[PDB]
Design a protein around this nucleic acid. Structure first.
Lengths: 257, 101, 192, 257, 257, 192, 192
RNA sequence: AUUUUU
RNA sequence: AUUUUU
RNA sequence: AUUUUU
């Protein structure tokens, strides 16, 4: 109806009053490069709202694959991602001879032990999330010369068990995922433990989700000459890990009621 | 000007803290000056107390000083509203903790 | 794809008409509807289908008990205060705490205090002593809609106990509604 | 050409540098909810121009039929509309005995009589309009016992006649829409009069468009015992009404030159 | 999503609550006449950029052909255009008797001679351009009675020749576009000379592109009685003209390095 | 449907080109064209087809009457002042009020006062005494268009009466035009 | 048709991404590409395919000549300073100005000054006295790209002349490159 | 890598 | 008024 | 120039 017709009311007029030399004027109307629009950009748990956007820029004929075709780093591309699920040494205590049956050799705070020190692959991420849901794969290793004998009970104890531990009858702990491992026969035990709790998620940096322990099934029968320093080591791997709740750096957050 | 409002789910320590790791939304003043921010369900349970643990820490920090001129205000008013998401649900009806009028 | 409007950037002055189920998203997020029970506890029929205490009356004689029934500003029934108009069946739960006797119960939306002097056709159900009944009063209102707030939003309840000897007691009353029709939601209530 | 490309120059780049975990960023650009538009609304003889409109609001799942399905008011929906055309009592004078032939019993200012008092159904609207074009339906009623006799001339006299009334020969008035009604025979007369004037429209609250009169064709012959108080009543209905020119409340406006 | 819906959220509502009398309200929303656009207009070597344009206007049912259908001016429409290429008198010197062979009768600064005076058809345009590329068509006229005899050498000398003129052997100049014209036989000579230079374009108002000269092939043999005042005239026409470089009015501009 | 532009909301700076027959509406209204007569009285041919007084001359001798014909700033012909250029037939109405004689009438657009001294071929129509004639002078102008305002916009009129005796009189002149071609309407005139 | 954007009206903040071959026009004008030679002199391969002086060394003994090869901030090779990274063949032109002898020439990108003490496999081409050779050193760099600016952007050149008697002289060195791969153009250099 | 030339 | 439940 | 009228 008007206010834009500036192009065909000048482009035509000349095209109507043109001679063999052609039109003496050309007029074109259109919208400005800077139009009235709004741009929104979302990254991980973030949203940037801009109402005065500008044409995004970038280098000449750029390549954003970001993958080094020469593989100057021979590793899997998802190495850094899976790194926190890596197998790690959770504990190593010494089986002190003369320890009656039932005696607890060593324990391990599950799952906060995987972030035991700032030198743990999972320690990094674990600090930026308050909630966790994961599966475990333990490998308790105990080496003893052939001359010696004995047996230890590697068992997983959920918070329920750990809470009421004294109320439970030892010798029945075989009801829990365990590995009566007879020394001089086995040097390592394997335990695959899924997420077990009375809550969908467990607070990061908590002893919840139970804890893995190692008891004395039958004390060590170490002959005279045989060595007497048996070490028990607990290794742990995360079959599957999941950090959800965001939070400040290593700040105690209550996911529970 | 710009303003970044973040939210740390289930946070309890009422203290100013960098929102770089929190669920935030940057607000650039324009024609539509009503920015939102969604907080996905986050609890150790499949259902949480309607009256118990906080929803989290809500912080709105200044990103870029509110600019103005000879005929414009040097400070403005803000309003914060809240509602439930399209996936919102309530479950058990319980007693009352307060009396309306 | 997703528009900037659904990413948080909107305008409060462009919300009308009332009732816009607009979806909100951002990377790594989407409205997830997970159910825990086989049915909803938010539906008006279900929630209100559950009674709530109303009031108690201690009788000594055979007098009558007239009381303006209204919506609660106290129990889960308070969720009704979010509405302006109501209409539908009304479930009245009465407990007759007496040693030996009978309790006449009736209900009407009629404001006149004389149409109740008799109880002819106002629903005189009989709860024997020490018993309790749940009568569902129909919408016998002269007004198409019941402002939900009125001190008599719900019709009046009548209780004329028929005692036999010096026996006395108390009548506790609680109530709910059957299928409720609420309209034109108003602003949330304040606290005392 | 630029200034909007913010969406596909960020949405694509990521879609180009994405790994098994998918893109790490999404950007969408579009127009603001508050666009540069103009709204115009017109009601009866009114036009509202707004250049800064906002999204119109309304209650939840509203019903604008505005019709009470229960009919708590049993009447025609167009009752209020037609109300002003309703039949009304325009006049009631007493036929004073001993009144020679030709004598004027009673007259009635047409059409301003339908707004005779503020208690006239048409009085309401008539006040908000200066122009009128309507048709009439009169019903002059005169009751007299059987013993008595007589006759009256109910005739419609346009402004032309009313103006020059004395110049016209009585007894010829039968040329105008009339009803020689012989008492003791008829108790009511019916007259359907269409819009008659030398102008398309007549000024509201004016005596124009003529006036209805009732004359004495033959005086009342009332016997000795018979009653002597005969009343003549004039009722009026609007076959069709039309108020056009708007004006202040009951303010004299000149539609004529 | 909002902010424009003002038209169908008011136009419909009424259309939903309308009775036999039809809707009591209509609302229409659209863009303002003054939209956010940009107009650009280009004339000869000019470009006008406006970001706040308005609807262009013009007289009632206008005719922009600009051609006088009555031809009140009987001439070719392109007369003014071609005017500068018109034939003109470039020089007229007198053949002074007793002038040995080889003697230069008269010369002419090419091409700046066509703008010799402000009375030259080409003088006008030549002033608004610094560069020139054109072709020539000379017509050297020399009239002599039959009794007399003689011959003149009309030859075109490019800048190269004019520069090193003394180094060239006369009598060999017949190698250049010339016209040995024997008087008493021919009264006019014709020479068509195209653009000749060592540069694509020649600076306007320059002696470059050579110059046309007239020499004495064989002196005039004028009998006793015969006349003794022979005039040599040089006429010039532009077969094709081309002014390119724009410049201030008659300001020396260097197109060369 | 109807746009807000046609409802009154417009911009004065977006009116060009000149001549925009835009429709204006609102509820309960629409451009209604009702005719009262079988033809238009606004058409240039019709309106101007009707004469209007010009001037009067009182003669005593047989002298000649030269007068610069121009458009009226007085009668209905004033509507011409709304235009700038004219061209077409010119109807001249002359009344010869004389007892005994003849009136020579002629018309030319030629400004020269000598080409009229004779009246050879300038249209010497003859109106006998006491008579009146209406001669239609063609567009014998040397200018394609006649500025409508000029004191001589219309060509000059000549009147050389051929009297017989001492008789004298007056020549009243009024005029109109046949099919007029007006162009480039200019702003409305002022009042005195 | 032509848009106002292509007529000069644009916005500097809407230029990204880098590299917009937008056409510019106006009446009586259009981009005219006219070639004078059968090929381009702007193409990296052609321009740089032509050597340029580097440096000169005057020898007296049989010592070795180690020199960090770099891009010129002096000749037409300076056009390289407009880039940030390089990779490809390197043409080294050496002139051995000596009366009687031989010149050992080698090239490596290895920074270690001991891997050169021997010249085992560093390309010991032999230019007899008074001769000159052009050896093309491959991209035997341990870095995928060579920052173009580094004082050693190009690998080091070695020259151990094998003289016979007291003879001495000077070794002038100039160089070019075979097919060069330049990336990420940086801002233009300043002048001294 | 028609990243010698066609 | 699948405004008991499917 | 249906720039007399249809």
């Amino acid at each position: 109806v008007g206010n834009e017709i500036g192009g065909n009311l000048l482009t035509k007029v000349a095209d109507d009053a043109s001679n063999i030399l052609g039109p003496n004027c050309f007029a074109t109307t259109a919208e400005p490069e800077n139009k009235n629009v709004v741009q929104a950009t979302t990254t991980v748990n973030t949203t940037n709202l801009t109402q005065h956007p500008s044409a995004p820029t970038m280098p000449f004929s750029p390549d954003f694959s970001n993958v080094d075709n020469f593989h100057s780093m021979a590793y899997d591309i998802t190495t850094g991602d899976k790194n926190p699920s890596k197998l790690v040494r959770l504990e190593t205590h010494e089986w002190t001879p003369s320890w009656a049956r039932g005696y607890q050799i060593t324990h391990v705070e599950l799952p906060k032990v995987f972030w035991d020190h700032q030198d743990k692959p999972a320690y990094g991420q674990s600090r930026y999330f308050a909630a966790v849901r994961c599966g475990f794969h333990f490998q308790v290793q105990v080496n003893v010369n052939q001359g010696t004998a004995g047996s230890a009970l590697v068992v997983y104890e959920p918070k329920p068990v750990v809470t009421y531990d004294s109320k439970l009858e030892f010798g029945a702990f075989t009801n829990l995922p365990h590995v009566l491992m007879n020394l001089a026969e086995t040097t390592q035990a394997d335990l695959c433990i899924p997420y077990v709790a009375d809550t969908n998620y467990v607070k990061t940096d908590s002893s919840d989700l139970g804890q893995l322990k190692v008891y004395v099934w039958t004390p060590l029968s170490i002959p005279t000459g045989s060595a007497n320093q048996v070490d028990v080591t607990i290794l742990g791997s995360l079959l599957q890990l999941d950090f959800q709740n965001p939070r400040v750096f290593a700040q105690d957050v209550n996911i529970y009621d | 000007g710009r303003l970044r409002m973040g939210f740390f789910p289930n946070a309890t320590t009422d203290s100013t803290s960098t929102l770089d790791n929190a669920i935030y939304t940057i607000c650039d003043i324009g024609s539509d000056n009503s920015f939102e921010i969604t907080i996905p369900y986050s609890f150790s349970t499949w259902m949480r107390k309607t009256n118990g643990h906080p929803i989290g820490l809500f912080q709105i920090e200044v990103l870029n000083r509110l600019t103005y001129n000879s005929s414009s205000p040097s400070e403005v008013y803000c309003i914060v509203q809240g509602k439930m998401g399209q996936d919102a649900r309530f479950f058990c009806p319980t007693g009352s903790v307060v009396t309306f009028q | 794809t997703m528009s900037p409007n659904e990413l948080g950037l909107t305008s409060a002055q462009d919300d009308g008409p009332l009732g816009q189920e607009k979806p909100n998203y951002f990377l790594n997020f989407r409205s997830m509807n997970v159910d825990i029970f086989t049915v909803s506890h938010t539906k008006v029929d279900n929630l209100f289908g559950r009674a709530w205490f109303f009031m108690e009356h201690t009788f000594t004689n055979e007098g009558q008990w007239r009381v303006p029934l209204e919506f609660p500003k106290q129990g889960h029934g308070s969720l009704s205060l979010l509405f302006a108009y109501f209409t539908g069946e009304l479930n009245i739960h009465v407990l007759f705490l007496s040693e030996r006797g009978f309790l006449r119960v009736a209900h009407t939306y009629d404001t006149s205090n004389d149409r109740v002097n008799f109880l002819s056709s106002n629903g005189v159900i009989t709860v024997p002593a020490g018993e309790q009944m749940t009568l569902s009063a129909p919408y016998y209102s002269n007004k198409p809609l019941r402002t939900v707030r009125d001190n008599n939003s719900l019709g009046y309840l009548m209780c004329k106990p028929f005692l036999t000897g010096t026996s006395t007691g108390k009548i506790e009353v609680y109530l709910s509604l059957r299928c409720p029709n609420f309209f034109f939601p108003l602003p949330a209530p304040k606290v005392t």
